[PDB]
Amino acid sequence: MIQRTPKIQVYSRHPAENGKSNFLNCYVSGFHPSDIEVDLLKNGERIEKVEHSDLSFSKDWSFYLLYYTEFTPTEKAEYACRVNHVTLSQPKIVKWDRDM
């Protein structure tokens, strides 16, 4: 058996084919086993519609999730990524930095 803690990155991107739109991303990488819970939060509340959830795995057994959705942020709300996994004794909450 092997278990590996997920790396968690939270960042924003504009797709080049539609640059006025902005997307909040959570890249959860390198984890094992694949069982996992991942949500985007706004002011601490789950974002219910997340348009994209893409899972893959590498040669060593090691899973990768890109979890993302269109959003329109502004100086007001706080956004974060919440992850729970067997390797994490508490849910990990990673805040979105608006410069990322």
Numbering used by the authors: 0 to 99
Q: What do the study's own words say?
A:
A recent case of systemic amyloidosis involves the highly unstable D76N mutation of beta-2 microglobulin (β2m). The D76N mutant is strongly amyloidogenic and, in contrast to the wt protein, aggregates efficiently and abundantly without seeding and under native conditions. Indeed, the 76 position is located in a solvent exposed loop between β-strands E and F. A detailed analysis of the interaction energies of the ensembles reveals that D76 is at the center of a network of stabilizing electrostatic interactions that are lost in the D76N mutant.
To strengthen this hypothesis, four mutations were inserted at position 76: D76A, D76E, D76H, and D76K. While D76K resulted too unstable to be purified, the other three variants were structurally and biophysically characterized. Analogously to the structure of D76N2, these structures do not show any major conformational change compared to wt β2m. However, although the backbone of the EF loop is well superimposable between the structures of wt β2m and the mutants, changing the residue in position 76 alters the H-bond network within the loop, in particular in D76A and D76E. In keeping with this observation, the D76A structure where Ala76 side chain cannot establish any H-bond with neighboring residues, displays an electron density for the EF loop poorer than those of all other structures indicating an increased disorder. The side chain of Arg97 presents different conformations, and the strength of its interactions with the EF loop and to Trp95 varies in different mutants; residue Met99 interacts with Ser11 or with Arg12. Similarly to the D76N mutant, all three mutants display a decreased stability and increased aggregation propensity, confirming the key role played by position 76 in determining β2m biophysical properties. A saturation site mutagenesis (D76 to E, H, and A) allowed us to show here how position 76 is indeed crucial in the β2m fold, any mutation at this position results in a notable decrease in thermal stability and a remarkable increase in aggregation propensity as observed for D76N.
